[PDB]
Write a protein that binds this ligand. Structure first.
Ligand code: TGZ
Length: 138
């Protein structure tokens, strides 16, 4: 497995048609996972599965600018399962990140950070065994 937290450079930033694939296994009794598409210190897109928020499971998405979090977008559809292998695919589209988990569409996140070519790192953290992190163009 790979080290966690893991930093995946995204050379020259992201661009529409870029596909990022994360393979991993959720730890048993996991509490949280996070993917962070970063533009310097800013987080353009924070994708944050929470396994126990008030005994509910929820995915929280947000953007961090100048060290401040913005308005959260929440998705109650929750495809992750403690102890089980997953695939997260993030397709960059002109106006949003499109996220699918285990080949099922999950959510879209409108670009708040609009300088896409400056979003040049993906951080992966939380309660997973990380198997692979890669990107390609489709
Ligand atoms: O400040 C008050 C608010 O707190 C947040 S909680 C906060 O949410 C942020 C996204 O918006 C990040 O997820 C942040 N976060 C999460 C992580 C993190 C770090 C490691 C692993 C891993 F999965 C996640 N780092 N920072 C988290 O602390 C509540 O959602 C909101 O309702 C309100 O109470």
């Amino acid at each position: 497995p790979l080290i966690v937290p893991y930093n995946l450079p995204l050379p020259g930033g992201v661009v529409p048609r870029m596909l990022i694939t994360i393979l991993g296994t959720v730890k048993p009794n996991a509490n949280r996972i996070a993917l962070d598409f970063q533009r310097g210190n800013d987080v353009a897109f924070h994708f944050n599965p929470r396994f126990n928020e008030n005994n509910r499971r929820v995915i929280v998405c947000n953007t961090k600018l100048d060290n401040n979090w913005g308005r959260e977008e929440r998705q109650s559809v929750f495809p992750f399962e403690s102890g089980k292998p997953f695939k997260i695919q993030v397709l960059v589209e002109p106006d949003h990140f499109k996220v699918a988990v285990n080949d099922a569409h999950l959510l879209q996140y409108n670009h708040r950070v609009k300088k896409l070519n400056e979003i040049s790192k993906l951080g992966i953290s939380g309660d997973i065994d990380l198997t692979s992190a890669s990107y390609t163009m489709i």
